[PDB]
Design an enzyme around this catalytic site. Structure first.
Site, PDB file in Angstrom:
ATOM      1  N   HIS A 137       1.139  10.556  -3.982  1.00 36.10           N
ATOM      2  CA  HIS A 137       0.844   9.162  -3.666  1.00 36.10           C
ATOM      3  C   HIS A 137       2.103   8.317  -3.500  1.00 36.10           C
ATOM      4  O   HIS A 137       2.002   7.198  -2.961  1.00 36.10           O
ATOM      5  CB  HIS A 137      -0.070   8.576  -4.737  1.00 36.10           C
ATOM      6  CG  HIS A 137      -0.585   7.198  -4.446  1.00 36.10           C
ATOM      7  ND1 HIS A 137      -1.198   6.850  -3.264  1.00 36.10           N
ATOM      8  CD2 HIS A 137      -0.524   6.069  -5.188  1.00 36.10           C
ATOM      9  CE1 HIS A 137      -1.543   5.571  -3.313  1.00 36.10           C
ATOM     10  NE2 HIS A 137      -1.158   5.078  -4.478  1.00 36.10           N
ATOM     11  N   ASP A 163      -3.242  13.223  -2.108  1.00 36.99           N
ATOM     12  CA  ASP A 163      -2.924  11.926  -2.669  1.00 36.99           C
ATOM     13  C   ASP A 163      -4.035  11.597  -3.686  1.00 36.99           C
ATOM     14  O   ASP A 163      -5.206  11.402  -3.309  1.00 36.99           O
ATOM     15  CB  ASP A 163      -2.868  10.888  -1.543  1.00 36.99           C
ATOM     16  CG  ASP A 163      -2.489   9.507  -2.034  1.00 36.99           C
ATOM     17  OD1 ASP A 163      -2.882   9.170  -3.155  1.00 36.99           O
ATOM     18  OD2 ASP A 163      -1.776   8.757  -1.330  1.00 36.99           O
ATOM     19  N   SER A 191       0.478   1.347  -1.118  1.00 41.16           N
ATOM     20  CA  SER A 191      -0.610   1.212  -2.089  1.00 41.16           C
ATOM     21  C   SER A 191      -1.236  -0.177  -1.902  1.00 41.16           C
ATOM     22  O   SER A 191      -1.560  -0.527  -0.797  1.00 41.16           O
ATOM     23  CB  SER A 191      -0.008   1.503  -3.485  1.00 41.16           C
ATOM     24  OG  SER A 191      -0.556   0.874  -4.588  1.00 41.16           O
TER      25      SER A 191
HETATM   26  C1  LIG Z   1      -5.773   5.348  -9.343  1.00 40.00           C
HETATM   27  C2  LIG Z   1      -5.548   4.332 -10.459  1.00 40.00           C
HETATM   28  C3  LIG Z   1      -6.177   4.608 -11.765  1.00 40.00           C
HETATM   29 CL1  LIG Z   1      -7.139   6.076 -11.934  1.00 40.00          CL
HETATM   30  C4  LIG Z   1      -6.003   3.728 -12.822  1.00 40.00           C
HETATM   31  C5  LIG Z   1      -5.237   2.598 -12.670  1.00 40.00           C
HETATM   32  C6  LIG Z   1      -4.605   2.284 -11.459  1.00 40.00           C
HETATM   33  C7  LIG Z   1      -4.739   3.122 -10.332  1.00 40.00           C
HETATM   34  N1  LIG Z   1      -4.255   2.804  -9.099  1.00 40.00           N
HETATM   35  C8  LIG Z   1      -4.095   1.598  -8.518  1.00 40.00           C
HETATM   36  C9  LIG Z   1      -4.482   0.344  -9.040  1.00 40.00           C
HETATM   37  C10 LIG Z   1      -4.192  -0.833  -8.394  1.00 40.00           C
HETATM   38  C11 LIG Z   1      -3.552  -0.831  -7.170  1.00 40.00           C
HETATM   39  C12 LIG Z   1      -3.180   0.376  -6.575  1.00 40.00           C
HETATM   40  C13 LIG Z   1      -3.418   1.595  -7.192  1.00 40.00           C
HETATM   41  C14 LIG Z   1      -2.957   2.886  -6.531  1.00 40.00           C
HETATM   42  O1  LIG Z   1      -3.206   3.979  -7.034  1.00 40.00           O
HETATM   43  O2  LIG Z   1      -2.248   2.769  -5.414  1.00 40.00           O
END
Ligand SMILES: Cc1c(Cl)cccc1Nc1ccccc1C(=O)O
Length: 264
Positions: free
Chosen positions: A244, A215, A94
């Protein structure tokens, strides 16, 4: 050393080749616990917690400092320097995939190989690029996270895990809910605001792009985008794993594919 203690740095294994396992959003280094037995015999494994992990003292999360990915890169490099590591293979899940990319640009000799899992250079869509998310929908999500963090976690965790693996849903929910809510929101905004597309061509080390099916965070086309734009020799691994967080949901299969990529 104060940093090594702060970010729960752990070095384990009987091997010599250094393997860094860097967790991503919503987890801590324990996300690697079921992978780890497969590497102890023949790697020297370095694990740490990102400053935003629920297992790190929230006093270390300086909102004036951690405004972009660069200070996260500084933390990674300071760890590897303090451990006296001058070359390693690096696995980033991620956001840690992007941290590793930036780290490699800063220190091109430090990484023999990057393995990227659930990686995206840009979550948001624009005219010529599909990231998977619209600005409008993401503001609605950020409002939900603020209004009731618990309810947000319980709605989000099954989407992130993706596959119907209830143990993994509960485990991801556990570590997400250990993160302090204002840190989670701030980190989320940080990364939705980030755009790594312009730097991908600067990377010169080989990248293995591990892409799962369906994912939630990463459209298939983004893996292909990484393959076309990362500056070194790139290999996409289309894993036979849904979701994911394959290290949480399908660790035995993921471990085998990591071993293959590391041998390549
Ligand atoms: C998708 C998402 C939402 Cl919708 C809200 C909040 C967080 C996420 N995700 C992410 C945020 C920061 C770093 C990585 C991710 C990830 O998904 O790998």
């Amino acid at each position: 050393q104060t940093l090594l203690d702060a970010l729960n740095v752990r070095v384990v294994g009987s091997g010599e080749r250094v393997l860094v396992l860097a967790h991503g959003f919503g987890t801590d280094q324990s996300a690697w616990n079921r992978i780890l037995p497969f590497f102890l015999r023949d790697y020297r494994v370095v694990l740490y917690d990102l400053v935003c992990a629920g297992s790190v003292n929230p006093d270390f999360f300086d909102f004036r400092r951690y405004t972009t990915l660069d200070p996260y890169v500084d933390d990674l490099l300071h760890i590897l320097d303090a451990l006296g590591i001058d070359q390693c293979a690096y696995v980033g899940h991620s956001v840690s995939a992007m941290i590793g990319i930036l780290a490699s640009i800063r220190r091109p000799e430090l990484f023999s190989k990057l393995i990227l899992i659930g990686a995206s250079p840009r979550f948001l869509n624009d005219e010529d690029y599909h990231g998977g998310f619209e600005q409008g929908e993401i503001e609605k999500v950020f409002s939900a996270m603020e209004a009731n963090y618990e309810a947000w976690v319980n709605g989000f965790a099954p989407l992130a895990v993706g596959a119907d693996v209830p143990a993994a849903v509960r485990e991801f929910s556990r570590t997400l809910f250990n993160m302090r809510p204002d840190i989670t929101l701030f980190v989320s905004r940080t990364v939705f605001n980030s755009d790594m597309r312009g730097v991908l061509g600067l990377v010169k080390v080989p990248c293995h792009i591990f892409q799962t099916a369906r994912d939630h965070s990463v459209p298939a086309s983004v893996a292909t985008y990484l393959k076309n734009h990362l500056g070194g020799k790139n290999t996409v691994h289309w894993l036979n794993i849904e979701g994911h967080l394959p290290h949480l949901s399908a660790p035995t299969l993921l471990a085998q594919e990591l071993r293959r990529a590391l041998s390549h």
